[PDB]
Amino acid sequence: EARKLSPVELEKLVREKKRELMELRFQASIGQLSQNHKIRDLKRQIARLL
RNA sequence: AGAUGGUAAGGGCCCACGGUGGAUGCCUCGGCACCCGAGCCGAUGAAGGACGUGGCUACCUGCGAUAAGCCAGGGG
Ligand SMILES: [Mg+2]
Ligand SMILES: [Mg+2]
Ligand SMILES: [Mg+2]
Ligand SMILES: [Mg+2]
Ligand SMILES: [Mg+2]
Ligand SMILES: [Mg+2]
Ligand SMILES: [Mg+2]
Ligand SMILES: [Mg+2]
């Protein structure tokens, strides 16, 4: 769990973004919603040791 | 008595200009053949797909719920 509880947080954030997108209120789309390239797989990469 | 000339609804032929049409000419990221290199993939789940994934994405190419992409090395 050295990298978890962070993607739970960032997937919570992306289900603030996808809420904000459906109503007409998401005015930085690719500036925010394509976080999941570097962010979000920011800490979805470790070698599963042991 | 007397004759040729005429009338063009429309037709014919020719000339001029159009439309329809897609031939011809000229192109090539396309294809064919030949010669070279290369030559297997799969329980470490293949070939092939269905579905999906872009913020809006219909389709194609991707790519798999990490879903036009992730991480590291190398080239630029
Ligand atoms: Mg003339
Ligand atoms: Mg003509
Ligand atoms: Mg024509
Ligand atoms: Mg051949
Ligand atoms: Mg396959
Ligand atoms: Mg797809
Ligand atoms: Mg998409
Ligand atoms: Mg979408």
Q: In this structure, is the CB of residue A3 within 7 Å of any atom belonging to strand B?
A: no
| DSSP of A1-50 | --STTSHHHHHHHHHHHHHHHHTT----STTTGGGGTTSSSSSS------
Positions of chain B reached by protein Cβ under 7 A: 54-55, 66-67, 69-71
Could you give the CA distance from residue A36 to residue A33 in angstroms, rounded to a whole number?
Answer: 7
Could you give the CA distance from residue A20 to residue A18 in angstroms, rounded to a whole number?
Answer: 5
Experiment type: cryo-EM
